Design a protein around this nucleic acid. Structure first.
Ligand SMILES: [Mg+2]
Ligand SMILES: [Mg+2]
Ligand SMILES: [Mg+2]
Ligand SMILES: [Mg+2]
Ligand SMILES: [Mg+2]
Ligand SMILES: [Mg+2]
Ligand SMILES: [Mg+2]
Ligand SMILES: [Mg+2]
Ligand SMILES: [Mg+2]
Ligand SMILES: [Mg+2]
Ligand SMILES: [Mg+2]
Ligand SMILES: [Mg+2]
Ligand SMILES: [Mg+2]
Ligand SMILES: [Mg+2]
Ligand SMILES: [Mg+2]
Ligand SMILES: [Mg+2]
Ligand SMILES: [Mg+2]
Ligand SMILES: [Mg+2]
Ligand SMILES: [Mg+2]
Ligand SMILES: [Mg+2]
Ligand SMILES: [Mg+2]
Ligand SMILES: [Mg+2]
Ligand SMILES: [Mg+2]
Ligand SMILES: [Mg+2]
Ligand SMILES: [Mg+2]
Ligand SMILES: [Mg+2]
Ligand SMILES: [Mg+2]
Ligand SMILES: [Mg+2]
Ligand SMILES: [Mg+2]
Ligand SMILES: [Mg+2]
Ligand SMILES: [Mg+2]
Ligand SMILES: [Mg+2]
Ligand SMILES: [Mg+2]
Ligand SMILES: [Mg+2]
Ligand SMILES: [Mg+2]
Ligand SMILES: [Mg+2]
Ligand SMILES: [Mg+2]
Ligand SMILES: [Mg+2]
Ligand SMILES: [Mg+2]
Ligand SMILES: [Mg+2]
Ligand SMILES: [Mg+2]
Ligand SMILES: [Mg+2]
Ligand SMILES: [Mg+2]
Ligand SMILES: [Mg+2]
Ligand SMILES: [Mg+2]
Ligand SMILES: [Mg+2]
Ligand SMILES: [Mg+2]
Ligand SMILES: [Mg+2]
Ligand SMILES: [Mg+2]
Ligand SMILES: [Mg+2]
Ligand SMILES: [Mg+2]
Ligand SMILES: [Mg+2]
Ligand SMILES: [Mg+2]
Ligand SMILES: [Mg+2]
Ligand SMILES: [Mg+2]
Ligand SMILES: [Mg+2]
Ligand SMILES: [Mg+2]
Ligand SMILES: [Mg+2]
Ligand SMILES: [Mg+2]
Ligand SMILES: [Mg+2]
Ligand SMILES: [Mg+2]
Ligand SMILES: [Mg+2]
Ligand SMILES: [Mg+2]
Ligand SMILES: [Mg+2]
Ligand SMILES: [Mg+2]
Ligand SMILES: [Mg+2]
Ligand SMILES: [Mg+2]
Ligand SMILES: [Mg+2]
Ligand SMILES: [Mg+2]
Ligand SMILES: [Mg+2]
Lengths: 159, 185, 48, 58, 172
RNA sequence: GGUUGCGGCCAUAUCUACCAGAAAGCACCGUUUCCCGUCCGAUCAACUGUAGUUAAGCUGGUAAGAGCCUGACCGAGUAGUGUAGUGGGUGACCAUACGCGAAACUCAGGUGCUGCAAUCU
RNA sequence: GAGAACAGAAAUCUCCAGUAGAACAAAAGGGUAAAAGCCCCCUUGAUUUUGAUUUUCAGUGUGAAUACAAACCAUGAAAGU
RNA sequence: GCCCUGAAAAUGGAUGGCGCUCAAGCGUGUUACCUAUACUCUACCGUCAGGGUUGAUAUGAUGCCCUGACGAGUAGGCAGG
RNA sequence: AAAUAUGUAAGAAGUCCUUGUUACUUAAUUGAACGUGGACAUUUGAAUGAAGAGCUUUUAGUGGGCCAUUUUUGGUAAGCAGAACUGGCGAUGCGGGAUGAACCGAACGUAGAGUUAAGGUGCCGGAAUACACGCUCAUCAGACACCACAAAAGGUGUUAG
RNA sequence: GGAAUACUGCCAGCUGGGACUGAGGACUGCGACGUAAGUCAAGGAUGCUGGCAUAAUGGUUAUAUGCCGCCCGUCUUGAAACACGGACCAAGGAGUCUAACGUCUAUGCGAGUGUUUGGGUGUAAAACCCAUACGCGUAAUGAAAGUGAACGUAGGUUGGGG
RNA sequence: GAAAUUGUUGAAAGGGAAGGGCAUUUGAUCAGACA
């Protein structure tokens, strides 16, 4: 009958990336995690100990614990109509620092600056982001660039 | 039609009067909705609602919980207000002076307060002395000390106490409550 | 703030009608829906 | 006498009435499952700094 | 699709730093309004060029009116179209007094004879046939003979009341 | 710049065939008392740095080289796809409207970058 | 592939090539090259205590599994495991 | 493309019927026109909400007064009668 | 290697400076975690919306479902059997599709006036025997989605290419 | 060369015909017109005139005419069904009471509470009064023997109405 | 001294059921309000 073991349906998920099998490079072990850090979760199939269940592949959570060979990650998972808190013991091989945050940290650190650069000068800042605006007017010149007239082309077969 | 985004004809959820039939209660309410409509003091608005509350949502305040509150920094001359009844407590030996305005004082409570040369005031007397609730400390009692709430949220690993009549070894203490008997909770 | 202040406008049906046999295809296919650019003014006036 | 076997039909309608409630979030979450050796030390650390504050209120 | 205007439409792909002033291309387009016209433009540019509307821009849009609207002209018309089972090129000739009139009767004709709706047609070219005798299709040659005259037999007048006291006459 | 010891990214570093490499280094290389390991001092161990050599390792350059890497309105706004119609068609299927948009292909350009430390005409 | 008495398609000896085309009880999929395969050396961590966690879920049980704490040991020059 | 052949079933019989042939048929275009418990404005009912009003010397404070929005319903819940 | 779908982030529970606590951890007052004191307010860190948001108890009915577009399995097929996402019917009248659970339009308090939807406007029947260009003649013509069927093949009928 | 016109759009340009509504009930607002006095179409209709004063209008009813309308009740995915019950009418005819309970609410009293087994008393099954116990609560946890709730302003931190 | 059901009298309708909805004509019948 049906079958639904732990690593069920994961053939291509935990698979290894073309011409990237073998030892994991040492940078994966030199990276350093602190409680609060935001991490993305993705399984290294060659590292059977400490694997995320496949539900958590592609998922991003927060470190809550740092352990000898691992980090404890809390993921919010929705079951029924509600989220429940989930805690994952993952070896450092199945985790990386998420950049889901840099645009923020980089933007903060920058936002402080142009605020100083304003204040100190005599204000007028405006530092919220804004959506793509529509385009302004413009004058396109014809010089070197007279318009080429095209028409639709007849039916033809090649074969 | 309207693609409604939220339930129609929904009642706000809040009492608007009390459920009680007591004339004197209804009179205090006559008083305090006036005060609330015409004084912009927030105290009056809070008091109005508390008058509507059912018995559960107004646990008794003990005279010792009053003595504590008067121990706050800068609070000793405040007049404590309790929109409910005030109960006695032999566990405190030394009880301060003050003025407590409340709906009911048990016999032993007004005794203790009065023996210390303090004063029991009804809510309307409070209104007259403090139309904006000036210099007033509102105390509420423990709502979630009730026996009922012991049993709210019963379920595995929740630690919340069976609805049970008899208790003892041999009432709901075997399979499911210990590692050696099926499992534990 | 200005625009939110305005309750959504309640309009009537177009007075001289929709100008098309069937409303629910794009303006570009002889329907009524989508961006009809400045032709909105004729519609909305007929509706207002 | 056979019957339907399974369907999700209508299940997300039901979950959306009361709604899919977002996770709910606390400042100071539980240390549940945090390294005991850490916690043991954290316990004395805190005790220590409390003392050093009540002291500074001598 | 309606009563046609003819439009010059001009577009280009958007400028970029390394390529400011992209090339600029033009199409004549027969449409009932400029909204359908810019639409048609983008439709054909994408059959010809790496572009689409999100990465291009309309530069200009102008209605072209007939130079000599009360001068009878012999049009050559070149069309691509799809049938129920294949796609086909066609040459037709239309005698009228404007390109715009001429293209209306073309769609009409294509709808009537070949059952081709508007979506299925591409006008490839509309051109005025300068010398009679480069006129090729006989259903027009016919109207070029000298001193041409013809009666309209069997005249049928529209009654305006439901009853009539005569008995009509189709004389003319 | 060379070179070595430890490296990071892990082919622009790999593969095939040629050739060039000063100085130092590294290497090949001599030995069998001693620790040590072998069917075999080939590997592994020790000892000399003496006796010998750039042949190989190593490093670099060559090639309308194989591979790999990068780019392009090269192919292609193609294939596929989200949304629309009381659109076409017996049907199989297919056009159109508002969007998103490949892979192969073709051509061009490239063939390791770099951290710590010691050393060198 | 090219080589060596008896020796042959197949015995045992050697060199070259070899990204895994093998092997890892078992189905199949994943994984793995100074290994996770093959050969050897030492061993009992397949042990002790009691919690937390992931899958199945009601976020019950059971199975199975993960990462720590507190012991006692194994191995290795060691980091470690 | 339209039409024609290919094209056989049981009571008499269905483009809904009548009937229609430069259609009242097929393809396409342009106006006008008809009409839903829908949309717009208005009155009245009720429901929900937000305001105002104890000042006596007259009559409903669960009252009175202003204002806005909303109204389908089996099983079923509650409410006022 | 898409499209659709999908995890996280877009700040006061934030960012920076100073330097306290410990039995953890470091060669090390090193780190780690929690802190004290200090500095910067609403363009404080995208959009749109918000008849507010959060939270607690308790209890009914239900636990045969079925249909349509799209994806889709088994089957020659089925008004057949089985899944996916949404939308419906069931529980729902009203206008249209003559008729019809599910299609189209549109969701209902009692009414006036107006305007429309989908669908129509020869007569039945409210509304042009309206306008305009073609095509079609059938001794079993054709006539509007879902939908109430027709194919290979063939015609020196006629049309345009 | 110089105009006109079409088309599309704009005007806080003027103006005619027709239909439905007229909610509200002193005044109070925002205005408009006037040199002013005053006036007005400016927070919801008034003025003038006629007819009848009654079955005239209106209600009710029967019938006719236009259009529309299938038997209800039931189980069911689906019933007007070629599914079941029901010829007709009266009258009867189905969630009750009790023991012990959960949640909610009202009321009394409150670290307590509960007079009604019983006693006293009586205008006699009522109403009125009451001593000792008992029950639940004020302590928990262990299988049990047993032990049994302040380091501290009954703690620190963050939010918190008032 | 109800209803089902029945006789007589009076009034009305009735081309293969009857009964019902919205609207008005026609007949019969009737409240109110005028002053
Ligand atoms: Mg299976
Ligand atoms: Mg294992
Ligand atoms: Mg307790
Ligand atoms: Mg008009
Ligand atoms: Mg008009
Ligand atoms: Mg009209
Ligand atoms: Mg239509
Ligand atoms: Mg209008
Ligand atoms: Mg069965
Ligand atoms: Mg079945
Ligand atoms: Mg079932
Ligand atoms: Mg040398
Ligand atoms: Mg030896
Ligand atoms: Mg040697
Ligand atoms: Mg050696
Ligand atoms: Mg050499
Ligand atoms: Mg080397
Ligand atoms: Mg090459
Ligand atoms: Mg598609
Ligand atoms: Mg379709
Ligand atoms: Mg295997
Ligand atoms: Mg190794
Ligand atoms: Mg074992
Ligand atoms: Mg169980
Ligand atoms: Mg288990
Ligand atoms: Mg027919
Ligand atoms: Mg007809
Ligand atoms: Mg027609
Ligand atoms: Mg007309
Ligand atoms: Mg209505
Ligand atoms: Mg309305
Ligand atoms: Mg209702
Ligand atoms: Mg998303
Ligand atoms: Mg989402
Ligand atoms: Mg808003
Ligand atoms: Mg609000
Ligand atoms: Mg429930
Ligand atoms: Mg239930
Ligand atoms: Mg149930
Ligand atoms: Mg059942
Ligand atoms: Mg549907
Ligand atoms: Mg049902
Ligand atoms: Mg419906
Ligand atoms: Mg008829
Ligand atoms: Mg008519
Ligand atoms: Mg079709
Ligand atoms: Mg039909
Ligand atoms: Mg033919
Ligand atoms: Mg009035
Ligand atoms: Mg009035
Ligand atoms: Mg009268
Ligand atoms: Mg009269
Ligand atoms: Mg009669
Ligand atoms: Mg009928
Ligand atoms: Mg039944
Ligand atoms: Mg059945
Ligand atoms: Mg029925
Ligand atoms: Mg039947
Ligand atoms: Mg039965
Ligand atoms: Mg029967
Ligand atoms: Mg009865
Ligand atoms: Mg007596
Ligand atoms: Mg007696
Ligand atoms: Mg006694
Ligand atoms: Mg005990
Ligand atoms: Mg003892
Ligand atoms: Mg703290
Ligand atoms: Mg009698
Ligand atoms: Mg009747
Ligand atoms: Mg009537």
């Amino acid at each position: 009958g049906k079958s639904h073991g732990y690593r069920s349906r994961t053939r291509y998920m935990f698979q290894r990336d073309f011409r990237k099998h073998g030892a994991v490079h040492l940078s994966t072990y030199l990276k350093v995690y602190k409680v609060g850090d935001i991490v993305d979760i993705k399984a290294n199939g060659s590292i059977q100990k400490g694997m995320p269940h496949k539900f958590y592949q592609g998922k991003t959570g927060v470190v809550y614990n740092v352990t000898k060979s691992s980090v404890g990650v809390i993921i919010n998972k929705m079951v029924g109509n509600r989220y429940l808190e989930k805690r994952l013991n993952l070896r450092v091989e199945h985790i990386k620092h998420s950049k889901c945050r840099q645009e923020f940290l980089e933007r903060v650190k920058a936002n402080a600056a142009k605020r100083a650069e304003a204040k100190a000068q005599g204000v007028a800042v405006q530092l919220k982001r804004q959506p793509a605006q529509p385009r302004e007017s413009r004058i396109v010149s014809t010089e070197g660039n007279v318009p080429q007239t095209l028409a639709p082309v007849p039916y033809e077969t090649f074969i | 039609g309207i693609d409604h985004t939220s339930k129609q004809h929904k009642r706000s959820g809040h009492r608007t009067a009390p459920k009680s039939d007591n004339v004197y209660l209804k009179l205090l309410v006559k008083l305090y909705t006036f005060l609330a409509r015409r004084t912009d003091a927030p105290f009056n608005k809070v008091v109005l609602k508390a008058l509507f509350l059912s018995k559960i949502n107004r646990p008794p305040v003990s005279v010792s919980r009053i003595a504590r509150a008067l121990k706050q920094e800068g609070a000793a001359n405040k007049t404590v207000v309790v929109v409910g009844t005030v109960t006695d407590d032999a566990r405190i030996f030394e009880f301060p002076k003050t003025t407590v305005a409340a709906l009911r004082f048990t016999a032993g409570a007004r005794a203790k307060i009065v023996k210390a040369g303090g004063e029991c005031i009804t809510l309307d007397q409070l209104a007259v002395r403090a139309p904006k609730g000036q210099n007033t400390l509102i105390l509420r009692g423990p709502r979630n000390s009730r026996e009922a709430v012991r049993h709210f949220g019963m379920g595995p690993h929740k630690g919340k106490a069976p609805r049970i009549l008899s208790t003892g070894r041999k009432f709901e203490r075997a399979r499911g409550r210990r590692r050696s008997k099926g499992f534990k909770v | 703030q200005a625009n939110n202040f305005l309750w959504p406008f309640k309009l009537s049906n177009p007075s001289g009608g929709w100008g098309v046999p069937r409303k629910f295809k794009h303006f570009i296919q002889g329907g009524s829906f989508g961006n009809r650019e400045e032709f909105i003014n004729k519609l909305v006036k007929s509706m207002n | 006498a056979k019957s339907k076997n399974h369907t999700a039909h209508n299940q997300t309608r039901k979950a959306h009435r009361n709604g899919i409630k977002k996770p709910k979030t606390y400042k100071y979450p539980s240390l549940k499952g945090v390294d005991p050796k850490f916690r043991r030390n954290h316990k004395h650390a805190l005790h220590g700094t409390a003392k050093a504050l009540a002291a500074a209120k001598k | 699709m309606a009563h046609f205007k003819e439009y010059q439409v001009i577009g280009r792909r958007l400028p970029t730093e390394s390529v400011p002033e992209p090339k600029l291309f033009r199409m004549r387009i027969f449409a009932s309004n400029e909204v359908i016209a810019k639409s048609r433009y983008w439709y054909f540019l994408q059959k010809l060029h790496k572009v689409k509307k999100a990465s291009g821009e309309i530069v200009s849009i102008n209605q072209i009116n007939e130079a000599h609207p009360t001068k009878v002209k012999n049009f050559g018309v070149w069309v691509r179209y799809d049938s129920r089972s294949g796609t086909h090129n066609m040459y037709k000739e239309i005698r009228d007094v404007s390109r715009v009139a001429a293209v209306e009767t073309l769609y009409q004709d294509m709808a009537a004879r070949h059952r081709a709706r508007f979506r299925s047609i591409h006008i490839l070219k509309v051109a005025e046939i300068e010398k009679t005798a480069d006129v090729k299709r006989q259903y027009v040659k016919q109207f070029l003979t000298k001193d041409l005259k013809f009666p309209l037999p069997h005249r049928v007048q529209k009654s305006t009341k439901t009853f009539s006291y005569k008995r009509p006459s189709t004389f003319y």
